[PDB]
Curated annotation (Swiss-Prot):
Assigned protein family: Belongs to the thaumatin family.
PROSITE patterns hit by this protein: THAUMATIN_1, THAUMATIN_2
Family annotation (Gene3D superfamilies): Thaumatin
SMART domains: THN
Compartments reported by the entry: Cytoplasmic vesicle
Function: Taste-modifying protein; intensely sweet-tasting. It is 100000 times sweeter than sucrose on a molar basis.
Name assigned to this protein: Thaumatin I
Keyword Disulfide bond applies: yes
Length: 207
């Protein structure tokens, strides 16, 4: 599958692509404003994620640190990133279908559109100014807006035991971005696409 990752933000972002135990394609790339990166994602990739990282620096060996979304200090991500991270999530060729979503469960850093570039299903977007409107307890010191599980680390917010419900914090994300997951047990906003679709992830999508 082809994924085009496009940075339309005014700021640089360091794109990342991983399935949690390995990079997808090169795993990461610096994208200055307006730049894009086209990757190949292998068919059958399950539990893949693409995200932006902000305010990074790296040395010539590709080791360094990002203020949002850092993946073990690497340019070329193999593992998932540190919250807060707006997440483009996908599982491909799963019993004939692809499944895509945007999630705010791990917070929000950069606005995102995640759309097919082939026919037959909708895209989703979360492009409200969540960072500017972020409630005080959720503001991350390095920038972006943490989820309440990261901040409070209890099942009330983390949905590890019993049956968690919405909180004022989850409702904040949901109100600003109805089409993204706001907590683990939110009513799903996943889109079913034809198997073997192609996609575009756009940071700071055009309104």
């Amino acid at each position: 599958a082809t994924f085009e990752i496009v940075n339309r933000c005014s700021y640089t972002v360091w794109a990342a692509a991983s399935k949690g135990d390995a990079a997808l394609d090169a795993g990461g790339r610096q994208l200055n404003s307006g730049e894009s990166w086209t990757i190949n994602v292998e068919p059958g990739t399950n539990g893949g994620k693409i995200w932006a990282r902000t305010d990074c620096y790296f040395d010539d060996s590709g080791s360094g640190i990002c203020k949002t979304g850092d993946c073990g200090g690497l340019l070329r991500c193999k593992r998932f990133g540190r919250p807060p991270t707006t997440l483009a999530e996908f599982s491909l060729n799963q019993y004939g279908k692809d499944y895509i979503d945007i999630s705010n469960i791990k917070g929000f850093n950069v606005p995102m559109d995640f759309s097919p570039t082939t026919r037959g299903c909708r895209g989703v977007r979360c492009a409200a100014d969540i960072v500017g409107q972020c409630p005080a307890k959720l503001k991350a010191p390095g920038g972006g807006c943490n989820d309440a599980c990261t901040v409070f680390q209890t099942s009330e917010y983390c949905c590890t035991t019993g049956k968690c419900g919405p909180t004022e914090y989850s409702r904040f994300f949901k109100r600003l971005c109805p089409d993204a997951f706001s907590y683990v047990l939110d009513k799903p906003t996943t889109v079913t696409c034809p198997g073997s679709s192609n996609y575009r992830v756009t940071f700071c999508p055009t309104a």
